[PDB]
A paper describes a structure:
L and P function as the RNA polymerase complex, responsible for replicating and transcribing the viral genome. P harbors an oligomerization domain (POD) for self-oligomerization, and the oligomeric P attaches to RdRp of L, tethering the polymerase to NC to extract the RNA strand for both replication and transcription. Here, we resolved two L–P complex conformations from the mumps virus (MuV), a typical member of nsNSVs, via cryogenic-electron microscopy.
In both conformations, parallel P tetramers are revealed around MuV L, which, together with structures of other nsNSVs, demonstrates the diverse origins of the L-binding X domain of P. Our study links varying structures of nsNSV polymerase complexes with genome replication and transcription and points to a sliding model for polymerase complexes to advance along the RNA templates. In cryo-EM maps, four P molecules assemble like a kettle spout stably anchored to L. Our cryo-EM structures capture the clear interface between two P molecules (depicted as P1 and P4, respectively) and L, involving the RdRp, POD, PLinker2, and PCTD regions. Therefore, the involvement of L may guide the assembly of P monomers in EBOV, MuV, and others. Residues from 249 to 299 of P are the major region interacting with L.
Numbering used by the authors:
A (entry chain B): 218 to 286
B (entry chain E): 216 to 273
C (entry chain D): 218 to 277
D (entry chain C): 214 to 304
């Protein structure tokens, strides 16, 4: 009779910390979002470096400049 | 009498499971975000690999 | 009563569905491993780049 | 009530097992956020060093030696004679 109710509260309790463990992982996305925001700046600085290298490469006078189309 | 309290606790169980469902769906969404960051960072890596070469010739 | 236990047969069926779905959520392990590998690679390759940058020669 | 008894048996023991797998799953995924914040720090270091190399690259010297010794043009032609299609900037 009452034993089943006892184990029932036991289940409620178990699930209650299921929430906690999950609450933690949901809160783990904080970096994921920031790292995306800052990776945007990493991307633009990378692109600038790549463009500078392309420009210096084509600045050599041995091989003349050929524009696509 | 007890069956009424049991009804309430089991209904609360259902609600708790719905909460877990939503939270873990948000976890799947975070996973979609991390996969986007995956492909984009791979593109960044490939670009950096492409530039290391000119480093010497120039 | 009986109605409640039928509601729990439905609800824990939803529970088996929940665990089935989070089985897919488990997949990001090797995923984060891969992303760690790529960025570490990025770090190593930019190491070479900064290494060759500091030099006495002037670019021609 | 015995029928209800084994019905309970099935409904409870089962969900208990499922929750056991569930707690094993979260136990396995708890390290993902930690390794993520590591990747965060290293990524910040990468951003810092990429920024400083951009800083050094903002100031570079490009020098053309020319023909100082006056060596003949005959061997001096070390250049490709054809237009080469290399994409620069946009493309």
């Amino acid at each position: 009779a009452n034993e089943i109710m006892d184990l029932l509260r036991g289940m409620d309790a178990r699930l209650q910390h299921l929430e906690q463990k999950v609450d933690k992982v949901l809160a783990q996305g904080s970096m994921v979002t920031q790292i995306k925001n800052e990776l945007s700046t990493v991307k633009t600085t990378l692109a600038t470096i790549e463009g500078m290298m392309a420009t210096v490469k084509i600045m050599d006078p041995g091989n003349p400049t050929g524009v696509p189309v």
